[PDB]
């Protein structure tokens, strides 16, 4: 059971209500129950925000809540810093972790609408000009013409209808260059296609943290985090990105699911820093991408009030639990059960449209054949 705000009280503080709370940490707490011999209730925080000693100053939410006395043990994913360290104690962390940045995964989006472009249209026309002219020129070089067009047409196209052959010696030498021209032309086409298929898709356009587009913000890229989070502490203690830091205050939030759906609706381009949650978000959503280098090596452990008699004991269990691998069992229980495609940004194409264009060319040539054929019928 879970005594929490009815409408979650983000402004209209509907009174509390028993809900159902359950997850990894709950498992942890019940283990610590079986090993520590205590009983308890459970409740939510007043605000939906971790807390910080903002301006006299005072800590929002759970921090100040514990500090008062109305609380006596704080178990949740909790970061570690110096500020919180100044007042309370907490044992070794139970899950090491860091920071990363997530972006709405892009689609491969093959580009083959060049189905006749990658040389030119100008080339596509001058080649037909050249074929006609060299055809009739070979004809004159003979002295088998009305169909000699078939000859060069096919030898470009590798048809093999070959109704005849040049009887004169002149063209009987000439045709070689035409053959080589066809060979090198198709070679060229293949080569430029292969090259044009090297243009990669730069996804993690931000390099770790030193990317200036994210080291100096551009209006083309939107970005934020959750307000009053420890991440803000980390930034404002590192004055460098202050601008971006200042900049990001134009976009901050109050909940993680906020930024979650924000990047889901493709407006917000990046969410951050809840790494050990971004993993589940990704491997259960498979429309998002993590990246960056790990920023702030820290760990989630359990905090308790100042110098309670419990500290010395708690740690023990944890290591005991880290000994028998029970931790890893909980991992397999609540962690690995999410999976989607994870190979890489794979290059491929099955483009129905870029070949549907040429299939329509097929169908059009069909009616062209009907028309021209009956034209020749009436002719003969």
């Amino acid at each position: 059971i879970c005594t929490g705000p009815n409408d979650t009280s983000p402004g209209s503080p509907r009174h509390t209500v028993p809900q159902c709370c359950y997850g990894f940490c709950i498992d942890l707490l019940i283990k610590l129950a079986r090993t520590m011999q205590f009983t308890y209730e459970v409740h939510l925080v007043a605000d939906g925000k971790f807390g910080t000693q903002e301006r006299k100053k005072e800590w929002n939410g759970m921090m100040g809540e514990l500090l008062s006395g109305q609380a006596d043990m704080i178990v949740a994913p909790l970061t570690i810093n110096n500020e919180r360290a100044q007042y309370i104690e907490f044992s070794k962390p139970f899950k090491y972790q860091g920071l990363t940045i997530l972006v709405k995964k892009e689609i491969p989006r093959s580009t083959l609408d060049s189905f006749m472009q990658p040389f030119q249209s100008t080339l596509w026309l001058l080649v037909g000009l050249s074929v006609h002219v060299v055809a009739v020129m070979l004809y004159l070089l003979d002295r088998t013409l009305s169909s000699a067009m078939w000859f060069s047409w096919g030898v470009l196209l590798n048809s093999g209808i070959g109704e005849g052959a040049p009887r004169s010696f002149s063209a009987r030498i000439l045709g070689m260059v035409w053959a080589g021209f066809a060979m090198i032309i198709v070679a060229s086409y293949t080569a430029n296609l292969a090259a044009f298929l090297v243009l990669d898709r730069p996804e993690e356009r931000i390099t770790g943290i030193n990317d200036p587009r994210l080291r100096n913000p551009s209006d083309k890229f939107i970005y934020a985090t959750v307000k009053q989070s420890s991440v803000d502490i980390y930034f404002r203690r590192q004055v460098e990105l202050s601008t971006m830091y200042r900049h990001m205050e134009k976009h901050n939030y109050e909940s993680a699911a906020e930024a979650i759906q924000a990047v889901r609706d493709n407006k917000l381009h990046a969410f951050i820093w809840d790494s050990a949650v971004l993993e589940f978000e990704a491997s259960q959503k498979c429309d998002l991408v993590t990246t960056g280098e790990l920023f702030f090596r820290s760990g989630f452990g359990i905090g308790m009030r100042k110098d309670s008699p419990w500290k010395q004991q708690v740690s023990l269990s944890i290591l005991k639990s880290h000994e028998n691998g029970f931790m890893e069992d909980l991992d397999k229980t609540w962690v690995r059960y999410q999976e989607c495609d994870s190979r890489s940004n794979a290059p491929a194409t099955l483009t129905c449209e870029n070949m549907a264009g040429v299939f329509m060319l097929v169908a059009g040539g069909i009616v062209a054949g009907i028309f021209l054929i009956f034209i020749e019928i009436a002719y003969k």
Binding site: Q120, L141, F196
Partner: peptide
């Protein structure tokens, strides 16, 4: 650089015209 240059086909029609000229020259015989 997707579409090739018309100029970026020099040797093509170079050899084309060369063959045409050699053809006429020999066909004189």
């Amino acid at each position: 650089s997707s579409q090739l240059d018309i100029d970026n086909m020099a040797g093509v029609f170079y050899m084309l015209g060369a063959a045409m000229a050699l053809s006429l020259i020999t066909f004189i015989s």
